[PDB]
Amino acid sequence: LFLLRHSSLYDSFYYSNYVNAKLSLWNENGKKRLHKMFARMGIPLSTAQETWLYMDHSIKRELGIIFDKNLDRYGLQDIIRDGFVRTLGYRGSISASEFVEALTALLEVGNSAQKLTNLRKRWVSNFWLSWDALDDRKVELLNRGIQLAQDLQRAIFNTGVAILEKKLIKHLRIYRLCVLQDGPDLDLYRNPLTLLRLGNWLIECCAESEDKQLLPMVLASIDENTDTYLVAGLTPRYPRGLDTIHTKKPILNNFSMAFQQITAETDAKVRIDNFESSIIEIRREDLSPFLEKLTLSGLL
Amino acid sequence: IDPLREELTLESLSNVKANSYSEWITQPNVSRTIARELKSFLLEYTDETGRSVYGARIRTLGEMNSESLEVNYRHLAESKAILALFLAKCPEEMLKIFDLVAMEATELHYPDYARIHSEIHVRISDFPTIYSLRELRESNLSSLVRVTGVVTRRTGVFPQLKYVKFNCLKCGSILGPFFQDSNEEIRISFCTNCKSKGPFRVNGEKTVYRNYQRVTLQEAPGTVPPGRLPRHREVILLADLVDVSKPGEEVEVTGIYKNNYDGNLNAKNGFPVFATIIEANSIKRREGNTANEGEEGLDVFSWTEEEEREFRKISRDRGIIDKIISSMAPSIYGHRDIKTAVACSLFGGVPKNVNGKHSIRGDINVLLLGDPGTAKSQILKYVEKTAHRAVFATGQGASAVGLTASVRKDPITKEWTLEGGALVLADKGVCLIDEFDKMNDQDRTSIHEAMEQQSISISKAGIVTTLQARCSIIAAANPNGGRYNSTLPLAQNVSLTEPILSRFDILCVVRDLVDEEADERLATFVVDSHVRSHPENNARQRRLQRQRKKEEEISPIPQELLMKYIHYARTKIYPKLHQMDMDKVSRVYADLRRESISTGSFPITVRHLESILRIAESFAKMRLSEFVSSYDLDRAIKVVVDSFVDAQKVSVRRQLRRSFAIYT
Ligand SMILES: Nc1ncnc2c1ncn2[C@@H]1O[C@H](COP(=O)(O)OP(=O)(O)O)[C@@H](O)[C@H]1O
Ligand SMILES: [Mg+2]
Ligand SMILES: [Zn+2]
């Protein structure tokens, strides 16, 4: 669940990739199913939306049993897991996943060639906010990171809702394709990490499920201040928590090789300077020929 | 076998062996039989479709965290006649048993629902017999009644003691908790242990509280005989029923007719006369729903899950907007430009609040300026019928503070207080003002703030407050001289001023012209409609089927389904704009301003660009779509440009139409 200990239980179930994937919370049916689940668990809606600290202690203590008996009905049996929780005297307790989420949020939104250099300088600066958050004396930074993580997850959820409602995810035999052109929050997706977050959200939702053959996904975004794309190849994922011989085997990311070969053969002034070779920057005009060549290559 | 656990059968249950219905029901075995039969009815009842109605109702009840299960009286009467008779004759104990059997059907679906709501109430929807406050007599005492009236007065919600605990003054022993009647006070005279004449201090370690409210129900003006004083009754609203009825509304009250001893009554009258009250069981909002009395259920605008699926299926159709427009006032022959505007106003736009500093209206106002006999009042009546919350007012029949809000002195507290008006009553609804041009200037001017700011400001008698008026206004007016003069500009044909005209999003000018083909077609349609509506031209199922067959001729969508669709779209759909042609809209606005520079023309301001956006939002909403498409924006642009062109004069109309042909 997303930041269970620093938000409400309703928010924790709502803004979770796995819960949305297994319930489709991006439409009204998913919300109705979630409300029905909460009603059968015996937790009032007002109680669920209460913050974690002030939630009724009886329900908080019984939460483990309540989940043990009710999550199986709705297919959320995988929510049960064992993690590491760290506490300091007279302070709140924070789990490892929540700490990592706060650090990533600080890294992402913490606060021609010239603009690119300025953006990369800003990211380098955010690195130091993330570094400072690792200290026990700087807890205000951690709280700020938690709030930014909540906001970023909300924005990514809105963008994913927009993508899925419009049916923007074109399906080609070799691979899937999704291109963002006129979203409300296009600026947030200049950072590769936010784009990867959105890509993971989309991969878990409606793709990990539906019993559809695994297919690599292409996610692209556009920034008007520079008029270029940020293409990011994403490897497919097996259903979460499904131990199997084929699930035991890993899935490799072949997009770096195909992108490099296309760039070398073609002439579109593509950038492969990023460490993650699957993320490239493409000029506005060249994306259509690049995708044509990608489809015709068949090396994905 | 324990005799207290044995049960009878239904035919044996019909045969009564007690001195009264209450005594028969209260017997252990009879109570067990009644509970078993009620549970069977709840679990096994099936409609024409074949699915359990009450299973779905219980599922929805649990989903929404509610504590009221609605049961239709007709269903119970058909399924179990004897139980319906018992409920009619002895509502109290029957309702207690029904409430118990309902928390065991709810708990069947949601095992741990007791942690949300301790108890669940059963509400009767359609009692076959309807009484007036004048018709009530002593024979209706301690029996379920259904009355209609006007909520003249209201109290604040108070916590009432569910259980009262008593302790002896002298002995100090604490008597057990006792049930608190809603009607009158509970007292202990004779102590079981102490046997002390003296009173008991009322004390309790822990007490459970209940919501309580009281209203003054008055005969509605429509039903009271002309020129006669109205009769009134006091209605008591218990938990979950409070705040459902607001003062000035018209409601139908299903409750228990109860009497109690009143000393002052006796004193004043001089006879042993008992005061009377009504214990509300269910409330149905009858305001603005006179023509909707033929339906069933407490709320006719509510929907079920299957109806929601049907709404989705209807919306997925490509030509949904055309069908919706065609279904607006099917009995009116043409005026496809007055139907489109009415549909857009009914669906409305999406209000916006930019960063919490800027507020933008999200409602559409329409004005009908036309000839005397062009079916405007009928359109207003249809809009009143279809809208969820509607208020109808006439020109001179409306005062400047009858609209908006007014200040009075409270009879009880002798203090200045605030009352609502037409606008207030039409919150998130529609306000219809027939004979707009005949309004007093003062009266007219009142609505200026309300129509754009969506708020009412009152500074009177030390009362400094701002209300919410999020109501759309559709008005019908007659041009100066009683007939439109197409040669003169629009401004010279009406006496309204620039601000009021600008506040109206859509203008629909109606002209009556003599034409052989148009006259023939209109006369044929009118005659066909008149023949169709002639009163002479299961039994309930047969009546519904023939009504549906009659309706199918003139409307592609059922009217009740249309009202439910409109309510669902308004409540659950909030479209947004993300992809749109900025240059197209900007050029359209600039061209409109340039053409409107002419003297006496229809005023044009940024309000109309915002109205174009609002109409695009409404068109998107008509399809239950979460995003505005280019087609909806084009349709809104066409509507606005067509209205502007039609508002012009004859001489320049051809030039204007030729110039604007690109957008339309
Ligand atoms: N286009 C039309 N289609 C069907 N009936 C019409 C049409 N126009 C007028 N009528 C009939 O003529 C009458 C017009 O009266 P009404 O519209 O109430 O007057 P006003 O237009 O001043 O409000 C109505 O009873 C209506 O049945
Ligand atoms: Mg009229
Ligand atoms: Zn005593």
UniProtKB/Swiss-Prot annotation, chain A:
Belongs to the CDC45 family. It is found in: Nucleus. This is Cell division control protein 45. Transmembrane segments: none annotated. The lineage of its organism: Eukaryota, Fungi, Dikarya, Ascomycota, Saccharomycotina. Required for initiation of chromosomal DNA replication. Acts at the origin of replication. Also has a role in minichromosome maintenance. Present with 1730 molecules/cell in log phase SD medium. Assembles into a complex with MCM5/CDC46. Interacts with MCM10.
From Swiss-Prot, chain B:
Changing residue 503 to A: Loss of MCM2-7 complex helicase activity. A motif (Arginine finger) lies at residues 502-505. ATP binds at residues 370-377. Its EC number is 3.6.4.12. It is an enzyme of class 3 (hydrolase). Residues 320-527 form the MCM domain. Keywords: ATP-binding, Cell cycle, DNA replication, DNA-binding, Helicase, Hydrolase, Metal-binding, Nucleotide-binding, Nucleus, Phosphoprotein, Zinc, Zinc-finger. It catalyses: ATP + H2O = ADP + phosphate + H(+). Changing residue 191 to Y/F/S/H: Loss of activity. Belongs to the MCM family. Present with 1690 molecules/cell in log phase SD medium. Acts as a component of the MCM2-7 complex (MCM complex) which is the putative replicative helicase essential for 'once per cell cycle' DNA replication initiation and elongation in eukaryotic cells. The active ATPase sites in the MCM2-7 ring are formed through the interaction surfaces of two neighboring subunits such that a critical structure of a conserved arginine finger motif is provided in trans relative to the ATP-binding site of the Walker A box of the adjacent subunit. Component of the MCM2-7 complex. The complex forms a toroidal hexameric ring with the proposed subunit order MCM2-MCM6-MCM4-MCM7-MCM3-MCM5; loaded onto DNA, forms a head-head double hexamer. This is DNA replication licensing factor MCM2. It comes from Saccharomyces cerevisiae (strain ATCC 204508 / S288c). The chain holds residues 174 to 865 of 868 of the full protein.
